[PDB]
Design goal:
part of a larger assembly; 3 chains; A alpha/beta; B alpha/beta; C alpha+beta; A: alpha/beta; eight-stranded mixed sheet; 7 helices; 8 strands; 17% strand; elongated; B: alpha/beta; two-stranded antiparallel sheet; 48% helix; 19% strand; binds zinc ion; 26S proteasome regulatory subunit 6A (chain C)
Chain lengths: 272, 286, 73
Amino acid sequence: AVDTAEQVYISSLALLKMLKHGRAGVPMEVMGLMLGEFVDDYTVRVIDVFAMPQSGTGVSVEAVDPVFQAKMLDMLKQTGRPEMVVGWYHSHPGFGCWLSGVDINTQQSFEALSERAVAVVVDPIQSVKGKVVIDAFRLINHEPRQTTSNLGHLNKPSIQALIHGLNRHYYSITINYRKNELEQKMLLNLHKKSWMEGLTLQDYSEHCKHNESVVKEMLELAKNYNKAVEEEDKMTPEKQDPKRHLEEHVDVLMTSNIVQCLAAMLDTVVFK
Amino acid sequence: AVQKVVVHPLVLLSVVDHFNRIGKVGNQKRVVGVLLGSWQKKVLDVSNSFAVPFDEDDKDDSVWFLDHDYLENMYGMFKKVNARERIVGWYHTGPKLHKNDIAINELMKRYCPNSVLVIIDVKPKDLGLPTEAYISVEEVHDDGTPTSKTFEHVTSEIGAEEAEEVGVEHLLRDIKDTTVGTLSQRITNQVHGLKGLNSKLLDIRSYLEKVATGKLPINHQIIYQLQDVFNLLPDVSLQEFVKAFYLKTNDQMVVVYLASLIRSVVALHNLINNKIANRDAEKKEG
Amino acid sequence: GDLVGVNKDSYLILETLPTEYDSRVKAMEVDERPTEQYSDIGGLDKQIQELVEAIVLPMNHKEKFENLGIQPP
Ligand SMILES: [Zn+2]
């Protein structure tokens, strides 16, 4: 029947594969496929993603080598992944997530292939500093889709794909990440602090330099804090400078000194 | 030799996916796959890995499938997509090694002269470092002990390329604890450090129990390195060290004095202004 | 200072090119090859011989000059 607000769950492995391949491809656009299950009409699951060789034709249907795709699928079936392929992702470095004119036609072919295949656009150079610019698109054939729920407008579109047709020729589908408790705190081991890192005593000369600088900054802040309190007269009732800056300085200084003293003490008494 | 191996998020997520994939239907003590990486200096950086058809007998510990042609053409295609990554090492998920594993490493040495094996215990979600790394060694041991085809530990750690770093952070965001964590996270980190130190010392206890009782062979090595560790303890309460410790602690105390006193002053300044404002409102209301 | 065709995005040199001087410079060269015979010039025979011995003879032979050791004009 006619589709709806829908959803697309992509796995952690899939997302990292996509981001890594995109950051490998920049500045040349690169593309590949995701494996997944059409679990139902209201959401599509993709798990695992495999990139495919970058031909000189650029991101297009011709860039999809049938031999490479077929034998990759066969070997993944042997290795334990019988997941049948819906979805193709491509990279748009330097510009937002939207389907270009080429992308419209590639997704038209992909839709003709299965029916509900989903396009994915990743910008590997804008997806940085903790923000990931990922988005997923489907083409329309009056009424664009059925809005039978409120989980279609929990997100907001963007002007870039708006002119490029985020509702005009294609529509964006809300993206969700199906992480589980096992992948959780498996990834976390990457920033996980080690016990020796916990008992590490920093550096005493560097700590003294830090206290030296921060107390001097405290003095220079208090100098104008005095002026601020001496202009308490309430001419033209007006968060810059003295008060909250002094607050953050005292907070960081006090916590650093307390933690250094505590680590030093614990090391003194426990280590012999 | 090889001094360090750094392991990226992608391989560990891939092996977790492989373990869930196989254990979903074909639950088995381990799964075996191949890592891809590059060499800087004498450190190794591993970010790629694929599952290979593998099978182990239950107790014969000599019977095993690892697919030659599958490994070869899968590597060829992974080279086609990205040619930098060449075959280094092989991974498995079994929390324990097997007598059968050194044959696996010898086969892998056909594809890499110094192939390194990595145990990734996916099921454990514990104190730390879910990756263990091992190289193959064959030497006379220099001490009269019989030589043997042996696995040797090489230190390992997790490091991320920037794209994998943003990818992992975005998924961790909801459960992510803040990096700064002024007091709470630091105190919890110190407590966790004491926990880890106690756990490691108890492991060393159990090893010494097994060595004295004889059920475990004396390595001669490490145990004398452990004796060096035991002689390395600093022995605090030596007098000039006590003087220096008191001096530095007093410096920390005067600094925290200044911070606390300023905090009290600013607290009073907020209090007085709040009283003035609410009293002004009360006086205006009448 | 060589002319090379590279990848339009990755900038990898994948072709070498013949050095291009300029469109005007390529316009200056003669391709029509005019047809005025030396006999068409009258009276200037001495000057014609001067120019010929100065220009053409170094082109045709180079042996009668080198056998002397002279630097041709
Ligand atoms: Zn595109």
